[PDB]
Amino acid sequence: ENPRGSKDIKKNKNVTNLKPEDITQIQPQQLVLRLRSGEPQTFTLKFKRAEDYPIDLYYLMDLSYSMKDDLENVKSLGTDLMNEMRRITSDFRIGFGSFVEKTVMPYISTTPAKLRNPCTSEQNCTSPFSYKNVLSLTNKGEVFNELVGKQRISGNLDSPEGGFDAIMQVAVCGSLIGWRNVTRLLVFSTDAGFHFAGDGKLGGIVLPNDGQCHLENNMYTMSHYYDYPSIAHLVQKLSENNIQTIFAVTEEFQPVYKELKNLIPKSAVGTLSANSSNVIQLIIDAYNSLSSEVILENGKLSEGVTISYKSYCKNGVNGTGENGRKCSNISIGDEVQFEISITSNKCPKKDSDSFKIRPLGFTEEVEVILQYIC
Amino acid sequence: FNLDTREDNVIRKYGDPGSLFGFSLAMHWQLQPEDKRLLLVGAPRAEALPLQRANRTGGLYSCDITARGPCTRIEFDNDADPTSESKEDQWMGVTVQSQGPGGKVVTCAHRYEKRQHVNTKQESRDIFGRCYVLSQNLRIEDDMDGGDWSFCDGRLRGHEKFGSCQQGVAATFTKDFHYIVFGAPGTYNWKGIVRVEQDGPYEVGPVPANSYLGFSLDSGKGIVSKDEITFVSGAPRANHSGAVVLLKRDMKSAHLLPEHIFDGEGLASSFGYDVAVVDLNKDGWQDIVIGAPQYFDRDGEVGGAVYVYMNQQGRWNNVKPIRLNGTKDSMFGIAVKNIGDINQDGYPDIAVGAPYDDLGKVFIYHGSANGINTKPTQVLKGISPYFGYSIAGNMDLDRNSYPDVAVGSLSDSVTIFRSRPVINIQKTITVTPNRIDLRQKTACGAPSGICLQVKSCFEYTANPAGYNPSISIVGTLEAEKESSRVQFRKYTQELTLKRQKQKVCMEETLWLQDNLRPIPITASVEIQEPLPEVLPILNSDEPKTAHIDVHFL
Amino acid sequence: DVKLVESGGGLVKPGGSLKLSCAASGFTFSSYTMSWVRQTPEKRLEWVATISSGGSYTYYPDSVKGRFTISRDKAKNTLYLQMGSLKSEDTAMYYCTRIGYDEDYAMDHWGQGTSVTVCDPMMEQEIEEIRQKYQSKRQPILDAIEA
Amino acid sequence: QIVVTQRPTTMAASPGDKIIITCSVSSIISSNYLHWYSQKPGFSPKLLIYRTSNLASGVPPRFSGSGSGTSYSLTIGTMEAEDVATYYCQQGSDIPLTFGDGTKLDLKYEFLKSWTVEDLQKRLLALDPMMEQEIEEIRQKYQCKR
Ligand SMILES: *[C@@H]1O[C@H](CO)[C@@H](O)[C@H](O)[C@H]1NC(C)=O
Ligand SMILES: *[C@@H]1O[C@H](CO)[C@@H](O)[C@H](O)[C@H]1NC(C)=O
Ligand SMILES: *[C@@H]1O[C@H](CO)[C@@H](O)[C@H](O)[C@H]1NC(C)=O
Ligand SMILES: *[C@@H]1O[C@H](CO)[C@@H](O)[C@H](O)[C@H]1NC(C)=O
Ligand SMILES: *[C@@H]1O[C@H](CO)[C@@H](O)[C@H](O)[C@H]1NC(C)=O
Ligand SMILES: *[C@@H]1O[C@H](CO)[C@@H](O)[C@H](O)[C@H]1NC(C)=O
Ligand SMILES: [Ca+2]
Ligand SMILES: [Ca+2]
Ligand SMILES: [Ca+2]
Ligand SMILES: [Ca+2]
Ligand SMILES: [Mg+2]
């Protein structure tokens, strides 16, 4: 007398050899695992990189006075970056947002004179704002140029800036931003540090960011009421909305953003040059590294259930532990294999529960049904 | 394990919605007007007072548990002068601290601002912060008592010096009644400084700009030297990770010098949001507990951490920390407090708040001879979100020789838990035919021909010394855990013990049976029993059972 | 306030030419993005051309690219659509529209439209049958008023 | 090219009736880029709702807009007789700018005397630009067939 664990595959449509919602990159898509406690099950996933999807690129720019000269090179980005990425895709959409800081003390001055011109009176700075969605995602590249050229610099008091409030809003206000179900790149270009959760106590803001949308007239209305997001909050909302993040920061702060990049799963970081001269090349190099890389991630597992990952990439690279969730140097059309060993220890739930496996940046998901035998 | 969470006994007090009643709280012992044990509660968004020109200024409350229902606001800071100052959104009661039994009380407003040339092209706004000291009776009477502490006012202005110093987010008294300590995190371009006052004020200037030194404070003797005082201040923004600094006051100068600097591993972990000094192993050298609420790692299933640094004769460089981890984005460690010895085993304990663990949880960790016990001996849960944002303890509220724990919130509520007395029950077991002889027959009633008289005796010890209460127990004797070679004439007697150190026994005969390896007999006790009264709890961190093996010959 | 006045429409021979003009009053002409939308006999709206506020860039649908050309005169406050190599598909009422915000491209003001067509006793019968058609639609309301 | 799909093509309702019209686009657009227009017969279109839910100036409170992603809707809280027109939705997100085919909302003596006096003549006034539109459509047709 001995019941044993089993595997069987329910949905196994082959990888595609053509809109992105119809393209298949991972197979099998659904399977059922019969688990006896202590015994592992082991299925393999095949990933084949499809040809480049369309691209929605949102440019979220630090708009402090240190960034004034940077505007004139980004002011031509709409047409330039589209012509520069024809090779990758001709279905390109671009948008623009801008941020400075929370509008309370001590992060800014609130004296009426500084509340209308935070910088020195010579400089014609506008009043400070938290986050403004200037131009929602569109292919009107020339419209991006005209609007960015018309954008007004401003400033604040302390050097670390509240870009985290803007990222959260960009990630979770999809209906206002206009994210399509395609490649979502979020470029975050600053030249200063960042505030994070817990810093808001100095401004009288202790309530944690609620991860909801609070844009009215394309401006963030509640930077006074919610703390800065935690990194965990940002990672949760960023990945849940398939936002691949590109940190274009200056060399002075690139160490902290390389550390931040390592905490965010689908993120690259490049070093911004002097006047944002090299940001077109910076993006496509960051795009080349994000698109030529696949990282799986699984949903919430009932406790008692272990999951292992082992990867087999091009040129014999074999990853284990948490690096078995990832493969790199993968070109278009390349295929790589993942081995997923999951183990249960209890008879935890009475009936079947399912979680899902997905590559980051895509809406594609592998559904894995779990059945415990007992 | 002995915090009474029976919702009959749990005390909950509420405040006006939106006031952040419960944001900060402190235990105070008023002594000589009357002996009253209070719990001071800060409400930094409390509605303003009439002559304050503001919509909401914040205040301090005082909850007597011996008294009925609503807590009372403390009347002070009704001043207001629009030409010079601004108390709008000043966050009075952002922190509150007791000096000690019969000592003074400090509360602060860290966004209180000082204005000049109002309505003028040259209007100035400086967010200095200011602090109130009150008597053991919560009032302004002595001269150094009361009034305002705003050391930043009158020093070089601008955000590079003292323009946005924001004194008062952290404040504490040294326990010898010598000094009062202030944190001012905006000083020197948000470097932050710490200020020791009441020979000559000692200040800083250790950590870089935009680090928020002075965000949290604690102090004690026995951190570095056994009778030199050390000032512990966290700086949660240091290098975008956080750090904690040990500060000594210099013999000759009026400067605080850094003796040691812990710093946090995690990026943006807010390492140092709260610090706590506690001698967890009672070895005479105070250890240091540091919370990192936003701790987040590459894997990303731990949310928040607490770092327990075990002291080594005042030498910290070799100290490796025990790290308690929290559940996913739980803000585990935003509040770490020395709660004293709640089970009176002789070792101080700590409480750790985790406000986003569902509606909020507070983990209680036990002190031990080997340091901290990493498995929480009790978990309190909240009934309204963000429970556990603030903690205080290390004072006996209901006067039963056991300290108590009070837990704040971001949801305008404060919960008070009272400690049950801990009964240590010693068990003895005597089977009087020590060894079984199966070749021996006897006149007892067993068809076997062989009997065993098993007797177990129960004493109870407890703290304090004079605590000699009624304890009605249920003794239980059982043998052969798993065949059943013996049987009684499971034996349960219902006993009772009148006072400490007095034995009470129960006895019964075990009949053997006809047809070899030792028999085990075990005895267990369970306590059974009927402003309210807390009842004793059995010490659950001692052995549940006593065992004996009778050996055949 | 804002008034847009189209003119220049008429009858044209296929492959021929037409030039339309919209005179803008009541708002600063150079601050706004102007565009031409046309309505076909099937009562369908077809966006035909758009030009920036400064005239530095223009957009056309591909059906009219090369044939039509949009322009504006900052000094005369008038927008032009020059049509060429015409056809029966271009037969439509051509409206002049202003875009209030370049961030949303909503056409907040429309002119009155100029008509472009591209190629007696029966005419009167058709027209009179319409006016009796509408006379019969009007009479119940007039009767209703009187009750 | 973004395809805008409007349904129903035509709808018949009575005063006090609550219309819900839907507009669907082939690809996701931001809600800032979907607008609604109305066209009384015999006149030109006039902006009714812009950025999905913002009423243009001079639009009564009974109109309302909603939606996100690819499905948007325009609802008339309680229809008045003057609301008889054809309603268009437009996406401004992508070049080319595309328009829906329009929903034509119409009406259904028995019911006429239910009405106020002023709306019976508002209706007369509405009918006249209808009629000369059809009449002048004829003239254009006849000169080009010449
Ligand atoms: C950035 O742009 C300004 C434009 O006037 C220029 O003067 C400045 O030198 C630039 N910075 C460089 C080239 O590093
Ligand atoms: C600041 O910018 C505005 C933009 O409209 C301009 O009109 C104004 O003259 C500028 N102010 C100064 C003092 O130059
Ligand atoms: C886009 O993807 C989401 C899930 O990622 C799905 O619910 C939605 O229906 C999709 N919509 C379109 C237009 O692809
Ligand atoms: C990786 O594993 C594959 C088979 O699983 C093997 O063929 C290959 O040589 C391995 N590469 C290395 C570098 O170990
Ligand atoms: C981090 O801060 C600590 C103490 O403030 C200092 O020793 C160290 O140099 C800092 N790290 C960097 C990279 O500057
Ligand atoms: C969690 O904390 C435990 C101690 O409670 C520690 O042993 C362990 O290293 C931590 N978990 C990690 C680092 O994954
Ligand atoms: Ca800042
Ligand atoms: Ca110790
Ligand atoms: Ca203890
Ligand atoms: Ca007590
Ligand atoms: Mg900057």
Choose one of B367, B393, B422: the last residue of a domain: B422
Pick the residue whose CA is nearest to atom 9 on ligand 6: B323
- Resolution in angstroms, to 1 decimal, for this deposition? 2.9
Choose one of B422, B437, B456: the last residue of a domain: B422
List residues of chain A with CB under 8 Å from any CB of chain B.
105-106, 109-113, 157-160, 193-194, 196-199, 201-204, 206-208, 230-233, 235-236, 256, 259-260, 262-263, 322
Q: Tell me, in angstroms, the distance from the centre of ligand 1 to residue A274's CA.
A: 8
SS (H, E, C) A5-68: CEEEEEECCCCCCCCHHHCCCEECCEEEEEECCCCEEEEEEEEECCCCCCEEEEEEEECEHHHC
Q: Do A255 and A347 fall into the same domain?
A: no
Q: Do B392 and B441 fall into the same domain?
A: no
Q: Tell me, in angstroms, the distance from the centre of ligand 6 to residue B333's CA.
A: 15
d(CA A198, CA B171): 18
Domain that holds residue A114: 50-294
Q: Tell me, in angstroms, the distance from the centre of ligand 2 to residue A125's CA.
A: 9
Q: Do B418 and B476 fall into the same domain?
A: no
Give the closest of A136, A137, A175 to D68, CB-based. A175
Choose one of B422, B447, B464: the last residue of a domain: B422
Closest by CA position to C102, among listed C24, C34, C29: C34
How many distinct structural domains can be found in chain A?
A: 2
Set of chain C residues whose Cβ sits within 8 Å of the Cβ of A95: none
Q: Do B40 and B79 fall into the same domain?
A: yes
- Could you give the C-alpha distances from C54 to A40, C32, C48, C57, in angstroms and in order? 68, 8, 19, 8
A285 has binding-site annotation: no
Q: Residue A179 and residue D68: Cβ atoms within 8 Å?
A: no
Choose one of A294, A318, A350: the last residue of a domain: A294
A contact chains, 3+ CB pairs < 8 A: B, C, D
- Could you give the C-alpha distances from C53 to A128, A236, C103, C112, in angstroms and in order? 27, 42, 13, 21
d(CA A170, CA B454): 74
Beta partners for residue B60, in sequence order: B42
Name the CA dihedral angle for B158, B160, B164, B168, rounded to a multiple of 10 degrees.
Answer: -130
Q: Do B521 and B412 fall into the same domain?
A: no
Please tell me if the CB atom of residue B406 comes closer than 6 angstroms to any atom of ligand 5.
no
d(CA D78, CA D80): 7
* Neighbouring residues of A146: CB distance < 8 A, sequence distance ≥ 6: C52, C53, C54, C56, C57, C102
Choose one of A263, A294, A325: the last residue of a domain: A294
Domain that holds residue C7: 1-119
Closest by CA position to A319, among listed A330, A308, A327: A327
Q: How far is C51 from chain D (nearest CA, A)?
A: 12
Q: Is D103 helix (H, G, I), strand (E, B) or coil?
A: strand
User: Which tokens in the block code for residue A221?
Assistant: 């209305």
DSSP per residue over chain C, as a string?
--EEEEE---EE-TT-EEEEEEEEESS-GGGSEEEEEEE-TT--EEEEEEE-SSSS-EE--TTSBTTBEEEEETTTTEEEEEEES--GGG-EEEEEEEES-TTT--EEEE---EEEEE--HHHHHHHHHHHHHHHHHHHHHHHHHH-
* A72 touching C (Cβ < 8 Å): no
Q: Do A44 and A75 fall into the same domain?
A: no
The answer to the question of residue D61 being in a domain is yes
Please tell me if the CB atom of residue B372 comes closer than 6 angstroms to any atom of ligand 6.
no
Closest by CA position to B309, among listed B332, B335, B333, B275: B275
Q: Do A65 and A142 fall into the same domain?
A: yes
DSSP per residue over A79-143, as a string?
HHHHHHTTTT-S-EEEEEEEE---SSTTTS--SHHHHH--S-TTS-PPPP-SEEEEEEEES-HHH
What values do phi and psi take at B414, rounded to 5? -130, 135
Q: Do A275 and A299 fall into the same domain?
A: no
D contact chains, 3+ CB pairs < 8 A: A, C
Q: Do A241 and A327 fall into the same domain?
A: no
Please tell me if the CB atom of residue B500 comes closer than 6 angstroms to any atom of ligand 5.
no
Give the closest of C104, C111, C118 to D92, CB-based. C104
The annotation places the binding site of B for Ca(2+) at: 279, 281, 283, 287, 341, 343, 345, 347, 349, 396, 398, 400, 402, 404
d(CA B207, CA B243): 8
How many distinct structural domains can be found in chain B?
A: 2
The answer to the question of residue D133 being in a domain is no
How many distinct structural domains can be found in chain D?
A: 1
d(CA A214, CA A141): 27
Strand positions, DSSP E, B99-149: 105-109, 113-116, 124-126, 130-134
Choose one of A294, A321, A345: the last residue of a domain: A294
Closest by CA position to B362, among listed B302, B328, B405: B405
Set of chain A residues whose Cβ sits within 8 Å of the Cβ of C105: 140
Q: Do B410 and B432 fall into the same domain?
A: no
Pick the residue whose CA is nearest to atom 11 on ligand 4: A316
Domain that holds residue D60: 1-118
Q: Residue C107 and residue D90: Cβ atoms within 8 Å?
A: yes
DSSP per residue over D32-75, as a string?
GGEEEEEE-TTS--EEEEETTTEEPTT--TTEEEEEETTEEEEE
Q: Tell me, in angstroms, the distance from the centre of ligand 10 to residue B369's CA.
A: 24
In angstroms, the first-to-last Cα distance of chain A is 12
| Among A94, A180, A183, A241, the residue to mutate for chain D (most D Cβ within 10 A) | A180
Please tell me the experimental approach by which this structure was elucidated. Answer: X-ray
Q: Residue B298 and residue A262: Cβ atoms within 8 Å?
A: yes
Phi-psi region of D47 (alpha: psi -120 to 50; beta: other; left: phi over 0): beta
Q: Tell me, in angstroms, the distance from the centre of ligand 5 to residue B236's CA.
A: 13
Q: Do A133 and A4 fall into the same domain?
A: no
User: Which tokens in the block code for residue D66?
Assistant: 């909603």
d(CA A77, CA A71): 10
Q: Do B186 and A202 form a contact (C-beta atoms < 8 A)?
A: yes
Domain that holds residue B445: 423-553
Question: Is the preceding peptide bond at B520 cis, omega within 30 degrees of 0?
Answer: no
What angle is formed at CA D93 by the lines to CA D92 and CA D96, rounded to 5 degrees?
A: 70
Please tell me if the CB atom of residue B243 comes closer than 6 angstroms to any atom of ligand 5.
yes
